[PDB]
Structure formats: structure tokens, C-alpha cells
From Swiss-Prot, chain A:
Keyword terms of this UniProt record: Acetylation, Isopeptide bond, Proteasome, Ubl conjugation
Family recorded in the similarity comment: Belongs to the peptidase M67A family.
SMART domains: JAB_MPN
GO cellular component: cytosol; extracellular exosome; extracellular region; ficolin-1-rich granule lumen; membrane; nucleoplasm; nucleus; proteasome complex
Protein name in the entry: 26S proteasome non-ATPase regulatory subunit 7
Summary of subunit composition and partner proteins: Component of the 19S proteasome regulatory particle complex. The 26S proteasome consists of a 20S core particle (CP) and two 19S regulatory subunits (RP). The regulatory particle is made of a lid composed of 9 subunits including PSMD7, a base containing 6 ATPases and few additional components. Within the complex, PSMD7 interacts with subunit PSMD4 through their respective MPN domain. Interacts with TRIM5.
Source species, domain of life: Eukaryota
Miscellaneous remark of the record: Does not bind a metal ion.
PROSITE patterns according to UniProt: MPN
UniProtKB/Swiss-Prot annotation, chain B:
Compartment(s): Nucleus; Cytoplasm, Cytosol
The family this protein is said to belong to: Belongs to the proteasome subunit S9 family.
Purpose: Component of the 26S proteasome, a multiprotein complex involved in the ATP-dependent degradation of ubiquitinated proteins. This complex plays a key role in the maintenance of protein homeostasis by removing misfolded or damaged proteins, which could impair cellular functions, and by removing proteins whose functions are no longer required. Therefore, the proteasome participates in numerous cellular processes, including cell cycle progression, apoptosis, or DNA damage repair. In the complex, PSMD11 is required for proteasome assembly.
Assembly with partners or alone: Component of the 19S proteasome regulatory particle complex. The 26S proteasome consists of a 20S core particle (CP) and two 19S regulatory subunits (RP). The regulatory particle is made of a lid composed of 9 subunits including PSMD11, a base containing 6 ATPases and few additional components.
Species this chain originates from: Homo sapiens
Tissue: Highly expressed in embryonic stem cells (ESCs). Expression decreases as ESCs differentiate.
Inducers of expression: By FOXO4; expression in embryonic stem cells (ESCs) is mediated by FOXO4.
Protein modification: Phosphorylated by AMPK.
This protein's name: 26S proteasome non-ATPase regulatory subunit 11
Swiss-Prot record, chain C:
Protein's name in the database: 26S proteasome non-ATPase regulatory subunit 12
Residues included from the entire protein: 305 to 456 of 456
Protein source organism: Homo sapiens
Disease: Stankiewicz-Isidor syndrome: A neurodevelopmental disorder characterized by delayed psychomotor development, intellectual disability, behavioral disorders, mild dysmorphism, ophthalmologic anomalies, feeding difficulties, deafness, and variable congenital malformations of the cardiac and/or urogenital systems.
Domain of life of the organism encoding this protein: Eukaryota
Assembly information from the UniProt record: Component of the 19S proteasome regulatory particle complex. The 26S proteasome consists of a 20S core particle (CP) and two 19S regulatory subunits (RP). The regulatory particle is made of a lid composed of 9 subunits including PSMD12, a base containing 6 ATPases and few additional components. Interacts with ERCC6.
Every PCI domain range: 1-116
Its biological purpose: Component of the 26S proteasome, a multiprotein complex involved in the ATP-dependent degradation of ubiquitinated proteins. This complex plays a key role in the maintenance of protein homeostasis by removing misfolded or damaged proteins, which could impair cellular functions, and by removing proteins whose functions are no longer required. Therefore, the proteasome participates in numerous cellular processes, including cell cycle progression, apoptosis, or DNA damage repair.
Family of the protein in this entry: Belongs to the proteasome subunit p55 family.
Modified residues (N6-acetyllysine): 64
UniProtKB/Swiss-Prot annotation, chain D:
Alphabetic keyword roster: Acetylation, Proteasome
GO BP, sorted A to Z: meiosis I; proteasome-mediated ubiquitin-dependent protein catabolic process; ubiquitin-dependent protein catabolic process
Disulfide bridge partners, by residue number: none
A GO molecular-function annotation: structural molecule activity
Summary of subunit composition and partner proteins: Component of the 19S proteasome regulatory particle complex. The 26S proteasome consists of a 20S core particle (CP) and two 19S regulatory subunits (RP). The regulatory particle is made of a lid composed of 9 subunits including PSMD13, a base containing 6 ATPases and few additional components.
Claim: Acetylation is one of the keywords in the record: yes
Family recorded in the similarity comment: Belongs to the proteasome subunit S11 family.
Recorded GO CC terms: cytosol; extracellular region; ficolin-1-rich granule lumen; membrane; nucleoplasm; nucleus; proteasome accessory complex; proteasome complex
Coiled-coil residues: none
Function statement: Component of the 26S proteasome, a multiprotein complex involved in the ATP-dependent degradation of ubiquitinated proteins. This complex plays a key role in the maintenance of protein homeostasis by removing misfolded or damaged proteins, which could impair cellular functions, and by removing proteins whose functions are no longer required. Therefore, the proteasome participates in numerous cellular processes, including cell cycle progression, apoptosis, or DNA damage repair.
N6-acetyllysine modification, residue list: 15
Name the record gives this protein: 26S proteasome non-ATPase regulatory subunit 13
Amino acid sequence: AVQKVVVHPLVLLSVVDHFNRIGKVGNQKRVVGVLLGSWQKKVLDVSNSFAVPFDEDDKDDSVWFLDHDYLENMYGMFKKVNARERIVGWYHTGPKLHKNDIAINELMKRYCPNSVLVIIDVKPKDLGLPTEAYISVEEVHDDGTPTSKTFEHVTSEIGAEEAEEVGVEHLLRDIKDTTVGTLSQRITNQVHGLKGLNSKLLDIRSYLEKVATGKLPINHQIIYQLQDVFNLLPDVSLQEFVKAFYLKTNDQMVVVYLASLIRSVVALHNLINNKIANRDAEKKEG
Amino acid sequence: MILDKKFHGILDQGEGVLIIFDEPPVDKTYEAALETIQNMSKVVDSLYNKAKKLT
Amino acid sequence: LLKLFTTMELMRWSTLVEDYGMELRKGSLESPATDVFGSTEEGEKRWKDLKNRVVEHNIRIMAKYYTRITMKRMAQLLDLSVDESEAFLSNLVVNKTIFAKVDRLAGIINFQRPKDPNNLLNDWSQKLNSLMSLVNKTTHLIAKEEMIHNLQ
Amino acid sequence: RPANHRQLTFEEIAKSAKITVNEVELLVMKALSVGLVKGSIDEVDKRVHMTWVQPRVLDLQQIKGMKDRLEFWCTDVKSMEMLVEHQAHDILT
């Protein structure tokens, strides 16, 4: 149904406010906020959101506390001031997906339309993208397990339309723009290996742990496609790609001729002014 | 007609083998060679200005 | 109809000879088969151009697969002369066979292995393979990472 | 065999299926007709090149070999990251 979503940083800075208005009490649980957006178009666009007092139990996980009057009053007044945005779903700040999320999401599945779920981290130490759109749809399983709520990962992007780019750029004054060239390219080409190294290294360790020490079926069926796609590149002998290395290396030669020739053109004004300025300033100094 | 370059091909007498091939990237060596020939005059004129100002 | 639908396996028409014969013999259904063969030449054109049409259509089906069926051996399995196979190639030159490769020494044909420009063909294949491995690797990795959360 | 000259010949198919050499073309034609394999072979002399396929049941030697090749890929990407980033961070930053 929905291919991609658009999440503005305003809601995540509202999660910064979720971490600001705590009051130093010692709970810091998965505070659930009422996510708002535009479900009209096929693409989802989050503009702003708000929160609702949400408290769980220490031992029992099935305890969840929501509010209907606060949702209808905040949504009623928010719709009165801005009717272009309506309820879409919710989101929790907890890093782990608990079992009670089917009951928490089930309320906004009954009263509200199909709600999207977003899992983020309480500490911004994760290098990866903090936002993951999880659609709440029921899927048929091939093994015969009963139909239940399944959270499929929907791709997400963090973009601002008109003003939040200006506000973020003015508040930071440290981040740089695209700036195609040497630095913005070589930084990605340096740290990219760590950007994949922390993800893969962080995932395959617990993966290999759950291979031998795993039960409660983790959908082992998708592991066959995992190792299949991993074995779709069986160390090609590079025999056919030699001519492609001749093409890319020939373009490399083109960049060699462009650099040497163009820089040789740049040497004109320098290697002329260095003489005509020094000898004339010297002969005319005294 | 191959000497007239109306199509891609080449004949043979000993074996009679027909080969058809083409070279699409024609606009690379032309622009590169023109940049080399045009830059030759730049470096030579630079050596004329420096050779004039020195000796 | 199911054999003529798609994925036409290379089979012998001798099994269809008795099927068409009994198709002319039985009168319970499709009775006007003798009316199909009413004219002395029209039915012969429908039959010769019918077997020709399927013996070209199966070539158009196996032409999608690059398995290199080695039509020199296929002419032996079909039990027919190579001259009318050259006439079949005379039907392919008007059937747009321009994307093919022949051999002077041998008789094996090639429906693939073009000049293969690395900036277009290997570019496309490497794009779909590498990118497909990247995003496909991206989906089930974190998806399974969410599947293992329910075990706690 | 995931790697190390995956390319094969019809001798193993005809030997394992006790079928003649005349029916292997119909056998691979049926294999491509089912849709579980996309293998297209550009061979001249009889050869069997295969492509993407799904086990769909189980493979423990491919789980252990999956850990071997996976750890090898991970330590090679890590080795290239430390190698390039080692002096690259010191000269460019």
C-alpha cells in the first residue's frame, strides 16, 4: 500500500522534549507519543505530533495506560487550529519491541486507521537511521502459524520542506552542505567502512548467537533467502570485467590528461607573474 | 562499399571470415586530442613570453 | 491449448498426428474438420503453415532462454533436413532475427553474447545485482532483528 | 558447490539421473519451464552452468560455511577499513 514515508525532525526533537520534561524521576520508560501525519496521499508525511501520559507495570508487561479524552481533545483542538493534518499512528522511544505493542497498537487500529509504528533509541549513540517505519498489517504465513499482527519495515527518509532546513542550519552552524569535491567525498569514503562495519558486525554476532542458541521460531524461512542472496556473488573470477577495468581505467586516463593539461594551463599566470612582478618590482623599487 | 564506409564489415580471401564491429565513443579522443593540440600553443606561447622576458 | 499456451516443451508432432486424425474421425464435437479440409489447397496451407507456425513459435520461445540448444543437434532430434531449417532461417530474417550470432566453421548459432558494452550491459547487471543485494540484504537483516525481539 | 568453478557438465546429471545424453536438453528445458532456476548456459561443448536456487529445507554445512565465509567477508571489510582509514585518517581527516 505505502512504499515510503517522510518523517520531519520536528517529531524527533519532540522526543528530545520527551527527554527534557522528564523531571529527573528515575523512570525513563517507553513514553508513547501520538504520531500525526497526512494519510491522504500514498506517501506519508509527518508534520508534528504530541504525547499522552503512558505508564506501564514493572513486572507485568501487558499493562498499558492510554487516554481517549486527551486524544480527542488534543486532536480536536489541533484539528481546529490546523485541519490539514489528522491522526495516523503512534511511536514509542523504547529500543526493544515488547509483546504489549500489539495491544497498544490495537487501540489505534480499532479507533484510528492502520497505524504505522516507529522504533527509535533513547540514546543517540546508534550510527544508523533512528527511524524505522513498521506498518501494522496482518500477513499470511506459509508454515501454518495463525494470522497475527506483523511489523514489516517500510523505508523512511528525514527531510524538511521549507523552514526546518533553515532553522536547523542556523542552529547548528557546524554541519556542511553537499559540497561536492574532495572533503565531502573522501569523508564518506573513509568512514563508510565503519558505517557498514558497525551494522554488519553488530548484527551477525547476535545472529550467529541465535543460530545455535535460538528457539521460538524466528522465521527461519527468510534465512534461506538471506544466505541465498549472500551466495548470489560467489567470488566472480573477474575474467569478463577486465575490459570494464580497461574502460574505467581509460576514464582514469582521461582524468589524468584533464588534470595535467588543465593544471598546466593554470601554471601560466603563476609562472609568468612570478617573474614579471618580481623583476619589475625589484628593478623599480630603488 | 566498405572502403566507402557505408556499414561495418570486412572481407577475407583465405578464410572468408566476416567480422562486424563498431567504436561508439568517438567524441572522447577528438575532444582530448583537440585539448592537447590547443594546449601545445599555450605552453609554447608561455615559453615565448618567458624566453622573451629572460633572454 | 495448454501446450500452445506458454513454455512449449520440444515434443514430437507424431502424437498430434493421431489427435488430428481422430479430430477428423469423431463427429460428436468439432465436426467440420472435413470443412476445414474442404478446399484442396487451403487446408494444405493451413496444415503446412500450422506445423510451420508452431515450429517457428517454439523457436521464438526457446530464443528467450540462452541455453544454447545447439540447433545442429536439434535438427537431429526433430528428424528433419537442415535445408528447410535454412528456410526457417529465411522465415527468421523476416521474423526479426537480427539479434543473433552464426558461425562459418561450425553450425551452432548464438542468440546472445553481444559485443557487450561494459558501460551499459555489465553496468545494468552490476547495478541490479549489487543494489538488489544491498537493499534485499537491508530488509531481512533489520526485519529479523525485529523478529528476535519477541523472544524476550 | 557455492564457489570454486561452479561450472559443471551434463555427465553428473546423466550419471545421477541414469538418463541418456539426448534427454538432458529436455531435462534442463523442464527445469527452466518450472521456474525454480534461471540458469542460461552460453556453452559450446556440453556444459551445465546454474544460477540462483533455493534450498527451502535445510543445510547445516552451509550454516557452518555461512559462518566461515561470512566471518571472512566481515574481517576482510574490517581489514580494508583499518587499512585505508589508518593512513587515510592521518593524511586527510
